[PDB]
Ligand binder design. Sequence first.
Ligand code: A1IHZ
Ligand code: MN
Ligand code: MN
Lengths: 137, 137
Amino acid sequence: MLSGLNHLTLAVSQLAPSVAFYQQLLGMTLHARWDSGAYLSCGDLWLCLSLDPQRRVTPPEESDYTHYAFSISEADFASFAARLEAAGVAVWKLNRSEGASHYFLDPDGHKLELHVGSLAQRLAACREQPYKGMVFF
Amino acid sequence: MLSGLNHLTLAVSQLAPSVAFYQQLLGMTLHARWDSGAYLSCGDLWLCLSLDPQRRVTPPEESDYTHYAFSISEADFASFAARLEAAGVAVWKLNRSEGASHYFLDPDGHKLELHVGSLAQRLAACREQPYKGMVFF
Ligand SMILES: *Sc1ncccc1C(=N)N
Ligand SMILES: [Mn+2]
Ligand SMILES: [Mn+2]
């Protein structure tokens, strides 16, 4: 049986700027760095940054909707989002926000998100505002 | 302050085979489905499948190393790998690093992994045999 994401690995084109983004700007904990990668944690998440000569800096209109959302409390959400905006972090556009969410890009164009709320909370909210054709199991 | 991974969203080209893969083959719990997506869970992981016409079925040689690893116990690893092999699921890499890993592709070419071992286990292995240029913090 599968239980949990073991780790998320992001391919990066330039290791140092990516480490700086996740550690300095997003506040994740850096545990180790080497010539071709780094290991960070964000709560229980194990994040690997892997230096990959294949990774391209990708504009958001050129990538699909695959994305990675990080949890933040309702009390911290707005000021963290505003800090990213003031720092000039690039954003990506959607037709609709997933509740209380802020959408932004990493240095290589990985699609990231800050979101307030759990899956249970989202399911409860969606019961009142369902997607088209939504069924709940 | 960020407190963990809130959710992983995968863009999919066809919803039905992706739901079959994640729910039936990989055993994740399906909580809701709508005309253009689904919500599943795998342990603490909130997985969203989002139908996206911009998703390309992507050969592994044409995507970078970004990948998503799921946790499984050592005792369960071999029979799960054999299940994937029986189902004809393609492998994109052989394991050459500490802790059991099976590297497999989803129907759209998303790069997945089964892994046994925590960040702590990896860091302990690395402190015994540090990678080239490795620094700890
Ligand atoms: S699923 C849902 N829940 C809450 C608010 C909006 C939506 C929606 N886009 N249908
Ligand atoms: Mn999202
Ligand atoms: Mn991995």
